[PDB]
């Protein structure tokens, strides 16, 4: 049923400690989890999930797996301390996805872009110019910090599509600390 795997870029930045959607922010990145993909396996029990941090050049905390206990356990210890990283963060996820089994599974990166990034203007050349020929899918979640609407980040999906793409959508839930229903209902996925 699911023609896709799953890798997630769970933010870890120093700014991630903030009251903007709930308790201490990240406490909410954790929030979807238990649905951030709980919904994704709410699909045929053959889906695959992942995890990738994005601070201090970012490490990887989960290798594609139709299991969730490990991802939750690692999520419990994601202490935020450091400047966010991108581009490199996305390429690490891209490689990890390439090392996916069951070639039938398509790719998907859900980017929880929270704290501001330092990406330059024409990052598209590496950010998106590949996903077409690589037929990759990337999703963007803006944990607030929407500085001037972060057109810089919006340009990533903008480079996406070109006719059809965007994945689900680059949904920037409003800074209103409503909840994750915005990351539960909004995502038709």
């Amino acid at each position: 049923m699911v023609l896709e795997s799953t890798m997630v870029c769970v933010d870890n930045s120093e700014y991630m400690r903030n009251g903007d959607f709930l308790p201490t922010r990240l406490q909410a990145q954790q929030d979807a989890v238990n649905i951030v993909c709980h919904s994704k396996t709410r699909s045929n029990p053959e889906n695959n999930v992942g995890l990738i941090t994005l601070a201090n050049d970012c490490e990887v905390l989960t290798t594609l797996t139709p299991d969730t206990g490990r991802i939750l356990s690692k999520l419990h210890t994601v202490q935020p301390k450091g400047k966010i990283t991108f581009c490199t963060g996305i390429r690490v996820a891209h490689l990890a996805l390439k090392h996916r089994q069951g070639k039938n599974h398509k790719m998907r990166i859900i980017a929880f872009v929270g704290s501001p990034v330092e990406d330059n203007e024409k990052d598209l050349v590496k950010l998106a110019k590949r996903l077409k020929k690589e037929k990759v899918n990337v999703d963007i979640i803006n944990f607030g910090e929407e500085e001037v609407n972060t057109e810089k980040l919006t340009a990533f999906v903008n480079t996406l599509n070109g006719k059809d793409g965007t994945g689900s959508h680059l949904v920037t839930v409003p800074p209103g600390p409503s909840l994750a229903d915005a990351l539960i209902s909004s995502p038709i996925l």
Binding site: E14, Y15, R17, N18, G19, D20, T24, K81
Partner: protein
């Protein structure tokens, strides 16, 4: 509670631009962004008398501090206490803050260093020494910080008001400079920080001149201008060409700590002269005559043997002393720093050696070719 911030619009520079905008910062229940603004504000030029108001604000924000990264929190607490500058008040505040944030976080280190600094101004033996040893021992598991390490080093070096810790004092100053990341310092501070290390290195009992200082950045960029009798002294010492003219002006510059140790300084200069004279010889006729030592050391013929014996005993050469032949035999285990021009001789020696080795290898290979295979 917030009314304090509301009415705190006056009594401080940058009122509108800082506080008025900051208001939204906590109205959005927001965070460590606020801490960064706070850091900028505290570092701002201010006589720092409103420490009570600032501190009440800090307590209010840190009630659920969490988002206040402990490292920044400790930095701000140390700055505020240093601005308040009341001895017992600050000491009690430091103890309370340190205990309250007692986590395994690498900030209790910073607090302990601050406490050592605070107590460093009085009773500098009982509690301070134990505290400095404790900070040293607990300073592990994270060499990459490079900041709490700098603070601890600076505390130690400021400890320099103590005779015994000298060579380690030079070591501490060197470590400060090395792990201070960039110099990132005002020229004003750098001048004194470099003169202090210069005097320390000159006065240490085992330290002679410790080359690589001359191109060590802390000195030149700050001292090249003027008031640099010390640098000429450093050049003379690392060269050892007596050149004891400089001391007539060095004493005037600093009678204390220099004139008080003329005997020790001159003994070191004599030893360094002996070493450098042994080094300038072309490694073939290392056997030198007491006449040479005297003429290069302005010491008596009789005293030469004692000077060489002292050099051996300290451990800068490993030759041997003989008399009936009126000569001395040296052999080295203590090498020093060099410069580009002095590397050309080494390169030439290596090239000649490589040519000779190739020649001998080719000779053996050619002649023995019958039985080699």
């Amino acid at each position: 509670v917030p009314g304090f911030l509301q009415q705190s619009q006056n009594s401080g520079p940058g009122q509108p631009a800082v506080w008025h905008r900051l208001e939204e910062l906590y109205t959005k229940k927001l965070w460590h962004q606020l801490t960064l603004q706070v850091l900028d504000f505290v570092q701002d030029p201010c006589f720092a008398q409103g420490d009570g108001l600032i501190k009440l604000y800090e307590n209010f924000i840190s009630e659920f501090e969490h988002r206040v990264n402990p490292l920044s929190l400790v930095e701000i607490i140390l700055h505020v206490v240093r601005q308040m500058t009341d001895p017992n008040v600050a000491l009690t505040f430091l103890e309370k803050t340190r205990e309250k944030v007692k986590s395994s976080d690498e900030a209790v280190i910073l607090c302990k260093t601050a406490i050592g600094a605070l107590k460093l101004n009085i009773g500098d033996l009982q509690v301070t020494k134990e505290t400095i040893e404790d900070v040293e021992e607990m300073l592990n598991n994270l060499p990459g910080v490079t900041s709490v390490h700098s603070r601890f080093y600076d505390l130690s070096s400021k400890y320099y008001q103590t005779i015994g810790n000298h060579a380690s004092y030079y070591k501490d100053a060197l470590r400060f400079l090395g792990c201070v990341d960039i110099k990132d310092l005002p020229v004003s501070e750098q001048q004194e920080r470099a003169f202090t290390l210069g005097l320390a290195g000159l006065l240490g009992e085992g330290v002679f001149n410790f080359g690589e200082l001359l191109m060590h950045p802390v000195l030149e960029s700050l001292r090249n201008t003027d008031r640099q009798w010390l640098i000429d002294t450093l050049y003379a010492f690392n060269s050892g060409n007596v050149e004891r003219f400089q001391t007539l002006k060095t004493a005037w510059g600093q009678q204390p700590d220099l004139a008080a140790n003329e005997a020790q300084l001159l003994r070191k200069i004599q030893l360094l002269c002996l070493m450098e004279m042994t080094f300038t010889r072309p490694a073939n006729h290392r056997q030198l005559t007491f006449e040479e030592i005297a003429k290069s050391a302005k010491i008596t013929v009789n005293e030469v043997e004692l000077l060489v014996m002292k050099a051996l005993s300290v451990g800068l050469v490993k030759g041997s002393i003989d008399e009936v032949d009126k000569r001395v035999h040296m052999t080295w285990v203590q090498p020093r720093v060099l410069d580009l021009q002095q590397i050309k001789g080494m390169k030439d020696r290596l090239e000649f050696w490589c040519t000779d080795v190739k020649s001998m290898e080719m000779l053996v290979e050619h002649q023995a070719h019958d039985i080699l295979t």
